[PDB]
Paper text:
AAA+ ATPases of the [name] family are ubiquitous and found in all major phyla of bacteria and archaea. They are proposed to fulfil chaperone-like functions assisting the maturation or assembly of metabolic protein complexes, and are often found in an operon upstream of a gene encoding a von Willebrand factor A (VWA) domain-containing protein. The most well-characterised representative of the [name] family is the [name] [name], encoded by the ravAviaA operon, together with the VWA domain-containing protein ViaA. Remarkably, [name] and [name] together form a 3.3 megadalton cage-like complex, consisting of two D5-symmetric decameric [name] rings located at the top and bottom of the cage, surrounded by five [name] hexamers.
Building further upon these results, we now present a higher resolution cryo-EM structure of the [name]–[name] cage in the presence of ADP, obtained without symmetry imposition. The resulting two classes, with an overall resolution of 7.6 Å and 7.8 Å, respectively, both display spiral [name] hexamers bound to [name], but show clear differences in the presence (Class 1) or absence (Class 2) of density for one specific LARA domain. The distance between the two [name] decamers is about 10 Å larger in Class 2, which displays a 6° tilt between opposite [name] rings in contrast to the parallel position of [name] copies in Class 1. A pseudo-atomic model of the cage was then created by flexibly fitting crystal structures of [name] and [name] into the maps of Class 1 and 2 using iMODFIT27. Therefore, we opted for the usage of a spiral [name] hexamer generated from the [name] crystal structure as a starting point for flexible fitting in the cryo-EM maps. While the [name]–[name] interface is retained after fitting, major differences are observed in the pitch of the [name] spiral, and in the positions of the four LARA domains contacting [name]. Indeed, these LARA domains (numbered 1, 3) undergo massive rotations when compared to the crystal structure, whereas the LARA domains of the [name] monomers involved in lateral [name] interactions only show minor movements. In the [name]–[name] complex, the [name] spiral seam is oriented between the two [name] monomers that have LARA domains interacting with [name]. This results in a seam that always faces either towards the upper (orientation A: “seam up”) or lower (orientation B: “seam down”) [name] decamer, and never towards adjacent [name] hexamers.
Residue numbers in the entry:
A (entry chain H), B (entry chain E): 1 to 711
C (entry chain B): 1 to 239
Write the structure that this text describes.
């Protein structure tokens, strides 16, 4: 942050001479001097260049063309406008947040002006930063406290060992000095919730529209366990979603509760929809309570909004129909439904306080923002007990938190505040919609097959596309209107291979081959398997990372139409088995795999397996208790009808749970076991595309074995 | 790491000219050149300077005086020794780990020599570093993988926001690029336990002498909950120690178990002793099973070795008498009992594998070592199930681990191997024993009172001082011989105020006043209260931080003997209440507080409130379940006899739990309640010395209120 | 105040090389480096030279010949003595007011040492100066309060008149900026006897051994008439 802009040139000498005198004075205090051209040149030095903090221009030349466009971006940006004798303000410059510093063109006083710019720049740094981060930067420059924790103390022990100097010289001197514990008085403690840590909870909850926002220092997987251990007594009843995360499964195995699994909608491509509106009724919830032994009235509800693919729900209807005093929204993929008008009334934080209910959300931080890993938040919207919920937070957070991550957790909330932060949300949407239009443009004009985006036929609007009932792009049979939404920054590329009715085609390329082809240039697919490609268009994906994805997609069509070899296209796959992948081309591998999907019938065995629910014998908490005693055995996959599993089956593809730890596969759940046996055959002929199921252990013959409980 | 040493000067020209040519060639690749003097000069450039990697000296001048002393400090240190025609090795140079690189004195070939030194230095970096850290540094320089987590992606989003540029330029470009997740193929995943993470777990266990070890990324407070949820089913029995940490109490509140509390020993100064050998017998443990309702055979035992003060136990006797198949050693304060001959047979890792049993340890990393915060380990010594213990580790660790801390967790283990790591533990012991002798030397020679070290009368030896039964320095009534040891690096300063029999004295200065004076200059006190002080002398405490404590202690005697004012000595305490601390001196405050301790009788009420354990009605797990329902109330401190508390009482001083959440104060635990009422009167007359009890809420009248359960 | 003294030469290289690295680091923050000779050379750099604030010497060479003579002159001079491995204090060094800052002989860490010396020097300036003077010096470097008396406002009106530029360039920029009235909140007022002016009356009366000391701004000739108008009734008698 040391860029000073000097716009325009009056041509006279009594105004350009102080500019040259100030040019030699600002460089003595480490400041870069730039000279833009016209008015459009200065506008390009703010959005693209974020390290600017000084604009020098004539006040009697552009008093209305510059004080309006700059205020729409950065409001606290200092403006070093130079006025004259006959200078005044304007009536249209009253409702604009600006910082204008007036000066003269006196000779010899250039040294005093340089001291005022440095003092004004320090005021801009001490304003846009939160008080918790301000105390961390000041402690590094000013701090002589000895006998503190940890033992490195800014890197003292690293300067004594030869191997330790390599780890200290990589990051930097200011990196280790900012890693301190709660042994500081002027910074407070995280567990005590006082001092700088007290104002941080009120600053994040005010920007993100909340009442009590904490800072989890162990990722989102840990924040979900704190919510479940507050409104779920022993032997109670919770309403957890079927498409739950791996951490959500362990929550049911650590608390003696009776969960009720829902039945979300799904199609044939593997993209799971959402929970229908009929499941939120009072006649549907009360029906499953009597059918499930040892279950009372549900007091907590876990709703995955959005899912792993990015599908927003309708919170305006759930907060009125669902009669649960503790409704949870797993917002681990939408930490931005507030800074845009096309996201109002779509999350739990949007709106007001529900009478008699509370909203708990675990918004991620190191997922689609800009902060260090293992960072999350706990949003509280309601009137709850502070002394009771505080005891549950200390059961998952250490007494010595890492301030390097805590400072970055609140920074993500400060980088989004103001118009300068709102441009990152709207900018990511404009770059996502532009990428959606480039696919349809390069599809009809091309000569052959091309990728397709799972989007409606009309994408001219800039909002969330609802999933209506008279459309064919979503493919969800019997879907509720005004319930399922679409995330514009979640582009799902549908590879050719299937029709629009749900059946199979003749010519197509699976998404597994494209997933490994993008890794050669440096593109990792978030979700792949059947015929889908999920990507993330967050604030980190700029205009360079967005355009590089389309170029790699056009190279796959060129290498496939010309019929190239595997060695001269996929060098990583060739190193796995050079003998088998010798005389094989890109067309022979793409056609052989496509015939195996039609032969084994994947869409039918997948739509019927994840739809039905296996018979749940005991609670998931009781399944983990029997494993600790040692009554577990390893049986084959073909010998498990009527047994109780111990681990959760997470088959890839797609990536959703199949059998919960504690269920039994009887005669009703027959297609459930058929889906596991189908993947063991299709993923054994060609190397590289082996079967990936979290729970099945590979032996020395090919048959996978699972861990069940002894009878 | 770019320091090249050129020792000695032959005086001839055919040997010094290649040195001058090499001086201009090494500077082109960024390398510092130093010219040491005699043999003692080069020895000081290794212990003090750690960024050295090149030693150039004549082979036919010091072939035995240098190859032996350098080998005792570093093994893989390159030695660029220049040999001659009549040069040979020595018989005493066969059992020494050295890296000698021979060269010649040829002119013009100085450029080829510089390329050999650069490659040798690169081989030194790729050898002393673990493969997990080496792969992380190479991924930063060589790594262009896009569309990966987290969202910052090396600091891309920070370059677009004006406030984000200040947070990115603080750490460094190489800091954000190393913060990657499991979206990398050539680095593997932490939960998968494969690739670089698989070899890292086998490397850490080999350094710390173990079979298998994990890497907890949430401090020691989280690692204790992973082991506790592995050998303690719902409704079992555990043997947890009374002197437990805040995280250890939450372990009993999250699992339906029946714990059995021990009775550790203690003196009058507040130093926590240890558990006697009689509690580890078979007739003692089985006696408390029948007396405790709903309790079976104990299947797990938790031992805090060492305690918060620093007193080791005897693992050679516990692993044979204590008949527990799962014995735990909370090693949160001794992560060094391995690389020293005076620490053999004192921890769980020292020795062999105990048949039919298993040892668990949670060695802290960000406590007395050199790494980032929130880092711990789980050492397992025995034969346990790999498929079962892995599920318990994922219930407390997120799916996206922060590799910036994981790389530092293994780095702390890599800094211990070799002679360069052994000098860090022994170096802190020599600096600790030297500081212990400086106190006794300045005690008799001084004129007046002086501080005392809780140590035996004979400290000439260099080992752990055993707590015998014929001594008066420890002050433990009926202590077991060859069971309690003293930690040399844990120097416990005793302030004059009590006698050797356990009574009081007329002239005395509390330790709370000295703790406030040390914070003024910049010294953080670890533990303080009655008449004791605790400090941490780890590997990070060099000779500068050690000598800075003695100077602050001598300044306190000068300011107290001359009778100075509080404003001219304690500026922080004066700002709390300038009106009350106006005409008060340093001698008036030190005498008024000492009379309050004798009047209220602190040593007698504290010693009798910790021995008598309150009546435990229900398990600690059932106490937290009743709080979530809402049956809690806030009553006064004087009205609570016969009630069940909800939280844990942690009074300061000292720092041990008083009443566990779920116990009841009846007629047997009468001195227990008297200890809480005594601190409310002594900590309410003088500002700054308020009562600090974790669990008591301060009202508007002075009487503290606690949270209990409804009847 | 920017004189750093480096006494004695051990003759070795692991101790003189950090001195050479520190010589180039202290000059970047405007600090003069002097190389005294023997023990009598350092004693002449304190009584004669008053702009000294840093003394660097070996702790294991003169631990009793320097910690006693310097304490008799300046009892608050920051000492930058460098200790070794086998270094300790002395029983005769307990009743002496000193400020010893210990360091080491490590390469590459010369930049961190320069930041500690500048921070320690700032602590010495904030200690030897009274709080009333501290508020005046801080207001010049940090203070943009306009529309306040006097009318010159740090010399603003002198930059407009040709004759006024000769009177402003004679004293200095910091001279006119330190001439402010009672139009500042964080400095109080002399007539109100509050804030920095209240602590100034207790700081002067304590050093000069008094109970209530004021500050007359019109010489002694005026202060004599202030006392005369307090204990002299109309038609009384004075001596
Ligand atoms: C990715 C994810 C998590 C894990 O996030 P972390 O911050 O790494 O713990 C948890 N829940 C959901 C729904 C996720 O998508
Ligand atoms: C300090 C301490 C802890 C907490 O350590 P962290 O690594 O910060 O979680 C846990 N247990 C004991 C016995 C401790 O002394
Ligand atoms: C010199 C003198 C004065 C005048 O002193 P000023 O500070 O200049 O006012 C007053 N009284 C006596 C006795 C003097 O000698």
């Amino acid at each position: 942050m040391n860029v000073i802009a000097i716009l325009n040139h009056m041509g006279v000498y009594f105004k350009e001479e102080p500019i040259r005198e100030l040019h030699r004075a600002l460089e003595r205090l480490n400041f870069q001097i730039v000279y833009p051209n016209d008015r459009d040149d200065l506008l390009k030095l703010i959005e693209n260049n974020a390290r600017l903090c000084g604009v020098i221009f004539d006040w009697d030349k552009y008093n209305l063309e510059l004080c309006e466009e700059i205020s729409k971006m950065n409001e606290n940006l200092p403006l070093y406008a130079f006025a004259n004798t006959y200078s005044t303000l304007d009536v249209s410059l009253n409702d604009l947040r600006l910082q204008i510093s007036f000066f003269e063109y006196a000779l010899g006083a250039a040294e005093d002006i340089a001291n005022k710019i440095k003092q004004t720049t320090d005021e801009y740094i001490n304003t846009i930063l939160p008080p918790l981060t301000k105390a961390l930067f000041k402690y590094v420059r000013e701090g002589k406290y000895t006998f503190c924790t940890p033992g490195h103390m800014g890197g003292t022990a690293f300067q004594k060992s030869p191997v330790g100097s390599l780890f200290y010289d990589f990051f930097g001197p200011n990196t280790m000095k900012s890693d301190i514990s709660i042994s500081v008085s002027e910074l407070g403690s995280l567990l005590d919730h006082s001092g700088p840590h007290k104002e941080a909870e009120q600053y994040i909850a005010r920007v993100f529209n909340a009442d009590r926002s904490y800072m989890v220092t162990n990722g989102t997987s840990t924040a979900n366990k704190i919510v479940g251990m507050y409104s779920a007594p022993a032997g109670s009843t919770i309403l957890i979603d079927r498409n739950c995360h791996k951490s959500l499964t362990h929550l049911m195995m650590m608390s003696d509760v009776t969960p009720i699994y829902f039945r979300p909608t799904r199609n044939a491509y593997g993209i799971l929809g959402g929970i229908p509106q009929s499941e939120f009724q009072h006649a549907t919830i009360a029906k499953r309570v009597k059918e499930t032994p040892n279950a009372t009235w549900p007091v907590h509800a876990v709703i995955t909004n959005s899912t792993y693919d990015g599908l927003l729900y309708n919170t305006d209807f759930i907060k009125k129909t669902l009669d649960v005093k503790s409704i949870h929204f797993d917002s681990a993929w939408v930490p931005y439904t507030n800074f845009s008008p096309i996201y109002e009334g779509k999350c739990g934080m949007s709106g007001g306080r529900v009478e008699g209910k509370v909203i708990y959300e675990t918004q991620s931080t190191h997922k689609l923002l800009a902060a260090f890993s293992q960072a999350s938040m706990i949003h509280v919207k309601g009137d709850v007990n502070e002394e009771t919920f505080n005891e549950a937070y200390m059961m998952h957070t250490t007494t010595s938190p890492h301030y390097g991550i805590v400072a970055s957790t609140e920074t993500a909330a400060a980088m989004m505040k103001g118009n300068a932060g709102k441009r990152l949300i709207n900018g990511s949407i404009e770059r996502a919609i532009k990428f959606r239009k480039e696919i349809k443009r390069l599809r009809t004009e091309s000569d052959g097959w091309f990728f397709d985006v799972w989007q409606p036929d009309h994408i001219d609007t800039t909002e969330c596309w609802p999933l209506r009932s008279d459309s064919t792009w979503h493919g969800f049979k019997n879907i509720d209107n005004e319930h399922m939404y679409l995330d514009p920054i979640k582009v799902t590329l549908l590879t050719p291979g299937m029709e629009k009715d749900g059946t199979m085609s003749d010519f197509g390329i699976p998404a597994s081959i494209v997933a490994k082809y993008l890794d050669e240039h440096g593109i990792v697919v978030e979700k792949t398997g059947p015929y889908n490609l999920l990507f993330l268009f967050s604030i980190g994906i700029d205009k360079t990372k967005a355009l590089s994805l389309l170029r790699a997609l056009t190279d796959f069509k060129r290498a496939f139409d010309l019929n190239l070899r595997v060695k001269n296209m996929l060098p990583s796959l060739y190193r796995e088995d050079p003998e088998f992948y010798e005389n094989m081309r890109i067309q022979e591998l793409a056609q052989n795999i496509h015939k195996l999907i039609v032969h084994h019938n994947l869409p039918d065995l997948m739509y019927r397996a994840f739809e039905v629910l296996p018979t749940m014998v005991m609670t998931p908490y009781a399944a983990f208790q029997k494993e600790l005693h040692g009554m577990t055995e390893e049986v084959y996959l073909d010998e498990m009808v009527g047994r109780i599993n111990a681990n959760m089956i997470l088959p890839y593809p797609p990536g959703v749970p199949l059998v919960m730890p504690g269920e039994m596969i009887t005669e009703e759940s027959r297609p459930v076991l058929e889906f596991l046996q189908m993947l063991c055959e299709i993923g054994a002929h060609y190397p590289g595309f082996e079967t990936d199921i979290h729970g099945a252990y590979r032996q020395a013959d090919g048959r996978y074995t699972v861990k069940v409980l002894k009878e």
